[PDB]
Every structure is written in C-alpha cells, then in structure tokens.
Design a protein around this ligand. Structure first.
Ligand SMILES: [Mg+2]
Ligand SMILES: [Mg+2]
Ligand SMILES: [Mg+2]
Ligand SMILES: [Mg+2]
Ligand SMILES: [Mg+2]
Ligand SMILES: [Mg+2]
Lengths: 168, 286, 159, 68
RNA sequence: AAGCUCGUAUCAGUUUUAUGAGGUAAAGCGAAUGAUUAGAGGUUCCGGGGUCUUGACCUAUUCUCAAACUUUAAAUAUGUAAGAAGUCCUUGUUACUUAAUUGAACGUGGACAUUUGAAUGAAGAGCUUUUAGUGGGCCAUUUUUGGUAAGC
RNA sequence: GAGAACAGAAAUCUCCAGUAGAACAAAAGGGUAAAAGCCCCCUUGAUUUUGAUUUUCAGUGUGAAUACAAACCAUGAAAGU
RNA sequence: GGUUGCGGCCAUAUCUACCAGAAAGCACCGUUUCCCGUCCGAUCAACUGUAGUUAAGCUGGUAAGAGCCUGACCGAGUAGUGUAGUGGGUGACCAUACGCGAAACUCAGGUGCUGCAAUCU
C-alpha cells in the first residue's frame, strides 16, 4: 500500500568549507551564484581552533540550499562525476545521502582564472508528502514510524532511477 | 526512554502539548483589573482553517470560556457569497457579520450603525454623547503571525466597520508602505470587494486559458465574470446589515440517531477478566 | 561576617513543588478579592515582583485595599511584648482565599434554617457545637465471633 | 566462625556472631530459595542471581527463564 | 507609685473543631546530583598490547554513604476562624467603574436575642502619666557547635 | 547518534534523539523553554511631582525594595508591559 | 456518540511498539498576478476548494509494557518523637509508663474528566 507515501526530494545543500576568509571566500561564493542562481550565505566559525587556523566568528564557510525541479538538475550533473556510483556508506540511518567532489569546472562552468578551483559538498534531504506537520507553527507533530524514511528505502529509491549501483 | 527520565518528566499543559494555545499572551489577554471585579474582558477570536473562517466573542470563566456570539464563513451562502469563503473579502464579511450580530443581541444595534460608505479609511468607533459607550472587544489572533496584508486584520476591519470598538492601528492594513507613514485608501478599498481576485482573473484569462479553466471553475459554471464579484460583495454587505440574526441549519436527524450510528464505529475497552484470559492464553501458546 | 539579606535562609521555602514548575495556571488571575476577605500568604518563586518577605510565609490576613494587579493585606506581627499592625502589597499570585471560614459560613446558614424550621414545632433548637462525648453502653455478641487467645512470641533473630 | 571470632579482638566495643538463616547473600530464607530454584525462577548472572516477576512484558519474561 | 474611664466584660504562656504554612528527625540511592564494592552480559573503520587480552563506554544487577544531596516525610512548636462591628430582604448616594443602574464602597427601612453559635477559667476589664535599680551573670535536664578532653 | 571532497578527537553542512544535563556580567542559592535563553527591529520609564508600605528596627536614620495616584513618553495589531 | 473553535484542572492526560477509523470536520495536498517574508513560496504571506489522499497528523483500541494516579490491619503500631522516674548500665546506650506516629517495601485496582458554542447517519 503506497498510494501517496512516495519518496521525494526535499532540498539540496551545496557546502564549500574554506579555511580562511576574505578574497578566497568571495571567489568561492561567486561559484554558487551562477551554479544555483541564488545568492549564498556565509557561516562564521563557532569557536577558534589554533591548529586549523580559524578564529571565533571569522566567516570561514559558505553554503546554499536549492529546492524544486532545479535541485534535481544539479544532482544529475553532480552524479556525472561519480559515474552514478556510491558506496554502501554515504547513506544515513534517517534516509539521507550525499557525496563530495574536488573540481567545479567539470560541472560545466568555465575555468575563469579569476575564480579558481574549489571542491563542493553535495547532500540531499529525502522526505515524503506531509512533512509539513513537523514544520508548521500550529499543532506541530511528529512523523509516524511507517511514514519515516529509511536507509534501505533510499538506496532502493536510488537504484530504480538513475540506474546506479552501490559499492560494498 | 529510561524509567528515571519518565518519572522526573513534567508534562506541559494539554493545550500547549497540542500546540493550540499560547499561554503567554493568553494571561495578558484575559486578566482583568482587580479593582473592576467581575467585569469581563471580551476577546474577538478570529481563526483560519482550510476553506473556513471562524469568528467568536469569548469571555473567560473559572469553569471555562463562554461564547457570546459566533459567525462562520460557511454561513455566507445565505447572504449571496458562494465563491471564496476564505479569501480577504470573506474575512471582512464575516467580521461585519459578527459585529452586527452582537449589537442586535445586546440591543445596541440602533446606535453605532458603523459606516455605510466604506472607502478604506482608518477610523475608530467614537462614543456618542450622553449615551452608552460602544461595546469593546480585543482582537485574539492566537498563533497567527502579524504581517501587513494578512486576512486576520481583514476580519478586524469588518468588526470595526460594524459598530464594534476594536482598538487597532492601520500599519498592518494592505496598502501601507513602510517608507511613508500613511495608509493608501484606494488600494485598501479594493481588497474589501475582492479587487486582488478580479485583477488575477482578467490577467490569467489573457495569459493562460488552461489554468484559468482549472481555477475559478465555479465562476464559469455559475456564470460570474471578473466584474461580478465586486457587486455581490456590495449586495452581501447590505444583506448582512438587514438580517444579521443567527439561523441554525435544520438537523436532518436527532442527536440520539447520530449517537447510535457513531457507536458502531468505536472500539470498546476490555475488562480485567478477559484481559487476564488473553495473557493466560498467550502463555499456553508460547 | 554575618549575612542578613532580604531573601536570606529561603533556599527551600521559595522553591517550586516537584514537577510543578513553569507558568501559573489562569485560575489564579480569574479570582476576585474584595476588602474584608480573608487570605493566606504563600509566595511563588517564579514571580519576583510583589513578593512577600519570608516572615509572612504561611500567615493569614484581611484584605484592606485592591489595586490593578495586587491587593493590600493586614497582618498582626508580635514585636517585643505587643502586636503591631503590618500592611503588605502583594500580587495575586502570592495569595489565595482562606478556607478557614468558608466552612463556617455554611454553619451560619445551617443555624438560620434549623432555627426557623423548629420555630413552629419545638423550643430549644440546640444550635451549639459540642465536643466528642464518651461512648454509650452497648452489647457485643459472640455469634460467629468467638474470642481468639493471643500470647507473647518468643525472641528470634531472622537476620 | 573461628575466623570471625579472631577478628573481634581488632575492634573496639562488643560484636556478636549470628548464623544467618538466609541462603548465602540473598534476602530469602532457605526454603523459599529452594522453592524458587526448582520452579526455574532463578537465573545466574555472575556471583549473584536474577529472579522472575509476574509483571512486565511477556516478550521479555519468556526469553529469560525458558524452563518456567 | 499616682491614679483615671467603666464594670459583664472581653480577655487567656490551655484544650477542642475547621482550615493553612514548614523541609528537621527518620527514610532514600536497581529516583536526580555527588561519593562508592563486586562480578555478569554486550558494544569499535573511534585507546593500547598481542591474532586476542587489558582499559573505555552500553544494558540488566550488587555492597555501602552525605551539615553545605533528594522524590517522600513526622513528633514538638506555629498563622487564622468559631457572629450584633452577625446574617438576610428591600432600595438611596457618587466626579470611581461598567456596552449597560453593571459593579464597588458607604447608607435608609424591615426580619432574627443571649443553647446568640465549641470547652475550661476569669481577685473585673480598659487606659494614661511619671520615675528607681539593672544593662559582668552562673547552674541543671534535653537539643547543639569548636576541641583528645576539661569544674573548657 | 547517524552522514557529507580535502577534513583528522575538535573547522562547515544535513537529519534524528534531547525537561534544560545549556545560557542568563560577578559569589552562592532560587527562578525561567512558542522564555527570563539566542538572533533581529524600534526605543530611552536609567524621566517629572510629592506621599504610603516591606526588610534591618527603638518600629529612628541610611541602603535597598514593593504597590498606587497625578503628568509626560517608549513599544506593540492589541490586550498589555 | 463522532468532529471543530475557545477553554478549566494540568500525565488516570505522558512515553514506547503495533492495529483501526462510516459520515462530517480537521488535515495533508494544488498555484505564485497581488499584500508580505526568505540563500530556498520549506517556514511565513496570498489565491483556488479546483487536480489528488486517508499515507501521515489527529482520534480510538491493543501490551502478565515503562511512567503516573488511588487504596490497603502490605510492611508497621516498626523507625522517629512530646512528657515522666533517686529506672538499668563504668560507659556507649537501652528498657518501661502516659501520648503522637512515618518512608521505603509488598499487593490490588485504574489509564483523563469536564464547561461554552457550532456541526454530522
Ligand atoms: Mg504575541
Ligand atoms: Mg527589578
Ligand atoms: Mg534547613
Ligand atoms: Mg538523617
Ligand atoms: Mg558594670
Ligand atoms: Mg523531677
């Protein structure tokens, strides 16, 4: 019985973790502007670590969230780099998954030596219709066990489409 | 969950567990000046569910809240409004309906006739000299967020225009721009008679016929074009002021008949004798 | 040196009850107090305004003034060898109606009803309370209740 | 008994040597412990034991003490 | 010490009845926090030796504790009430308060006498002025702090 | 706890569990979860006039604190504060 | 009796794992011209009730369930305690006389009640 409990893409987050701030971060933030069509948001460092070379509230990283049909388009181009292959890991016990890349030029953007080369973090959030019950202001509730997203459900969902496989 | 966690857990209030009542604002909404003794404070409760609008006048008592008057959006069909029972214009009409209904009940409908020439102007219900002060209520919006243009303030306008004195400001009405501290009456008046809906109908008709057929299906079936919703709202306002009394729907069946049918679809608890049988039987099988 | 602050030695007195923290229920604010009412004082730890001093904890007084969110209470305080009158401004969260007379007003109503009821029939309406009296004579039967003999038990350790 | 008697000389005050009627370090009398053991209500866990109660879920009380 | 106003009158180092307040004695640790003995069953791409042990946490148990820990919680002490300045019925004042003669406060007039609202007692109760000496204390039972202890 | 290029015990991102085991300038004890904590917006009531009350107490002072009245203001859709 | 709005007491109401739910209601759900708010119409705002679904929320039932609540000559008149003696004992402490009287433990039962308004085979 699966009349409406079909697995669905909730959102996709593109995270670029830059050690320092300033010119390096601005160029990294430039990549996400046209890769997703949206202005990104920078995150500050929670507490300083001397070894990593960051200070408290230094605005080190940047991320962006994309939803709707645009999210699938970026995911498909991001899966071209992996050749539609993932490990038995990369899938959370909550039904979420993600992967990382080392270059952003191979997505389709030009080299642009005024920007540079950056890696990206892909993470896809999965859910089902009716997840609003945990996000609405009034009468907030919790999703039932049968309606939850499972690791075995996501990998099966990832196999039927994209004709991909999972490693050991 | 360990037994220690459960034992020391303190459950919140039932209305807070269900996420329906904000007790922080409730205390300030219902607490009366102690030197005024049993003088009740009346709340104008306005709630918005899917495809329905609810308006009530409620006073608080130790045993429980007491309703003074009620007005439902689904009662608008008997006043000429059938389409859009949840939009901004519907909120204004049911806000007017509750205001006129309570004035008649208290015998004060003759005085404080409201405004018969609505033009989107911000004004309060002034008291009359050597006479009774207007009935005063305070707006209760519950968990609704306060944003300019929200439908809750639309029901507020109808109650104010209906003769009720409801203290409020005009910075949350549509047409108020944050750059200049003044209201725009011409844009506010359009929302009263569904001006925003009319603009959508004419624009969507000349942009995409498929969506204009999918939406506004009742308008096509009943032959109401983009210039007919404004006049039916105008006629509805005059109909509300004419017969604002409450008429309940005739019950097809009695409460006893309803009770008997609902009994068949309810599961009943088990007493101790058969509960002991179930566990004893499970022992013999396991 | 010694310490004698306003809330000294109130570590346990002003605590909330177990699993009874949080907001105040609304029935506290819906009660009505009038001049002449008898109220008893119990501070609430979560309301820091209009809080009584620790001496008046558990004391009972009479309302003499009513304000917006508070009432005035009169307390007799023994100082030296005589009592002095004390006036307190307390928010309604820290007080409640005293039941030391709600069960006395009903006896007043009962006395009037009994006095009027017997007026037409019998004199000596007998509306004074009496202390517990010694038991009257009675007969105890042994039918099915034959006395059972008991004896002291020997000493044992069972440890 | 002789070992405990010799230990009294190291302590001030008066001490008594009492022969307990309980089974070992348990809080049960000897006849009570024997009755529980023959009914399969005692399970060994290290140096002490665990007993079977009439409360709790049957799912937990069946996998333990299968003899009962 | 001088009295003064009055005299059945209210009062009481007391009990009873009704109704509050408290966190000490005790108790508790397979209840929170903090100590603490012993095994048992499990867990690792996440400690270290060795091809399998010792430490780590997990779960179910076990021994023993707290002036500055605690769910529970006495005994003794402790607040208030037990009527005439009371109760009830009717309706007058106001610039306060109420959508409103709605309410609040204070009153007019009417109805109910001392089994008139538990017990016991009461060299009567209430009140004012003025001034002496004193402001080194110590002992006993019980509770209790410092100290090995002390006629400390 | 389960996951994501460089990335590791600790950088950033996502979900789940989470009665407060956090935080609230300072000593400690109370208090607090659609807040009294975190972030954002607007502000000066940390204002004017003179009384009453609580604590230490001789029912003196000083310090601190509580509830109002009469003004003028802030904030909010509003009750309110 | 079911359901919705507003509540009162604030776990007999919570928590864990499963099953069920006619009618209506509630809800998920569809859309982005307009008021409005975001990195993201996810949250918030508006529009339609039309295209869909009881999958979840929600409600009820089930469990020698955990927790919670109530009671018991269950433990126990035990621990503790007011008062008394030219009582016992080197002492530490203890017994008796006239009174008050716990907690843990054990067992049994219970698993929300209810006010105002509206609506429904
Ligand atoms: Mg609010
Ligand atoms: Mg302050
Ligand atoms: Mg103490
Ligand atoms: Mg002790
Ligand atoms: Mg001298
Ligand atoms: Mg003597």
């Amino acid at each position: 019985q699966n009349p409406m409990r079909d697995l669905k893409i909730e959102k996709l987050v593109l995270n670029i973790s830059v050690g320092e701030s300033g010119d390096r971060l601005t160029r990294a933030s430039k990549v996400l502007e046209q890769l997703s069509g949206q202005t990104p948001v920078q995150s500050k460092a929670r507490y300083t670590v001397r070894t990593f070379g960051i200070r408290r509230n230094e605005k080190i990283a940047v991320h962006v969230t994309v939803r709707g049909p645009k999210a699938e388009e970026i995911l498909e181009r991001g899966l071209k780099v992996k050749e539609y292959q993932l490990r038995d890991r990369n899938f959370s016990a909550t039904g979420n998954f993600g992967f990382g890349i080392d270059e952003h030029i191979d997505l389709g953007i030009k080299y642009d030596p005024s920007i540079g080369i950056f890696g990206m973090d892909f993470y896809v959030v999965m859910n089902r219709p009716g997840a609003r019950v945990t996000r609405r202001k009034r009468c907030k509730g919790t999703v039932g066990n049968s309606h939850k997203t499972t690791k075995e459900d996501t990998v099966s969902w990832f196999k039927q489409k994209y004709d991909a496989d999972v490693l050991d | 969950k360990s037994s220690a966690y459960s034992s020391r857990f303190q459950t919140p209030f039932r209305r807070r567990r269900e996420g329906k009542t904000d007790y922080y604002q409730r205390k300030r909404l219902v607490t009366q000046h102690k030197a005024k003794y049993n003088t009740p404070k009346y709340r104008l409760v306005v709630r918005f569910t899917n495809k329905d609008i609810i308006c009530q006048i409620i006073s608080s008592t130790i045993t429980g809240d007491v309703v003074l008057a009620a007005a439902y959006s689904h009662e608008l069909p008997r006043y000429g409004i059938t389409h859009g029972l949840t939009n901004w214009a519907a909120a204004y009409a049911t806000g007017l309906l509750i205001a006129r209904r309570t004035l008649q009940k208290l015998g004060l409908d003759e005085t404080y006739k409201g405004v018969e020439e609505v033009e989107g102007e911000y004004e309060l219900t002034e008291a009359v000299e050597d006479g009774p002060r207007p009935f005063k209520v305070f707006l209760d919006i519950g968990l609704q967020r306060t944003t300019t243009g929200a439908r809750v303030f639309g029901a507020l306008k109808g109650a104010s225009d209906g003769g009720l004195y409801v203290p409020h400001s005009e910075n949350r009405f549509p047409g108020w721009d944050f750059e200049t501290e003044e209201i725009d009456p011409e844009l506010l008046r359009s929302y009263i008679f569904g001006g925003h809906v009319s603009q959508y109908m004419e624009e969507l008709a000349d942009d995409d016929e498929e969506r204009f057929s999918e939406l506004f299906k009742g308008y096509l079936a009943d032959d109401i074009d983009a210039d007919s919703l404004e006049d039916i709202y105008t006629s509805a306002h005059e109909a509300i002021r004419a017969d604002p009394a409450f008429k309940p729907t005739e019950k097809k069946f009695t409460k006893e008949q309803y009770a008997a049918e609902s009994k068949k679809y309810r599961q009943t608890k088990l007493s101790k004798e058969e509960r002991a049988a179930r566990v004893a039987a499970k022992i013999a099988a396991l | 040196g010694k310490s004698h602050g306003y809330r000294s030695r109130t570590r346990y007195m002003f605590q909330r009850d177990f699993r009874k923290h949080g907001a105040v229920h609304l029935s506290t604010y819906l009660k009505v107090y009038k001049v002449g009412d008898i109220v008893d004082i119990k501070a609430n730890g979560s309301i820091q305004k209009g809080m009584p001093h620790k001496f008046y904890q558990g004391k009972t007084g009479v309302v003499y003034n009513v304000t917006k969110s508070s009432v005035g209470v009169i307390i007799n305080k023994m100082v030296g060898n005589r009592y002095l009158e004390k006036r307190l401004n307390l928010r309604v969260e820290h007080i409640k109606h005293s039941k030391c007379r709600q069960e006395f007003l009903e006896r007043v109503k009962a006395n009037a009803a009994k006095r009027a009821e017997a007026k037409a029939q019998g004199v000596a309406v007998q509306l004074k309370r009496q202390p517990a009296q010694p038991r009257e004579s009675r007969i105890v039967s042994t039918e099915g209740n034959v006395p059972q003999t008991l004896a002291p038990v020997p000493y044992e350790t069972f440890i | 008994v002789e070992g405990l008697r010799r230990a009294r000389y190291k302590f001030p005050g008066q001490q008594k040597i009492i022969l307990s009627k309980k089974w070992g370090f348990t809080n049960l009398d000897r006849p009570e412990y024997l009755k529980k053991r023959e009914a399969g209500e005692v399970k060994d866990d290290g140096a002490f034991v665990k007993f079977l109660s009439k409360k709790g879920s049957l799912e937990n009380n069946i996998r333990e003490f299968p003899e009962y």
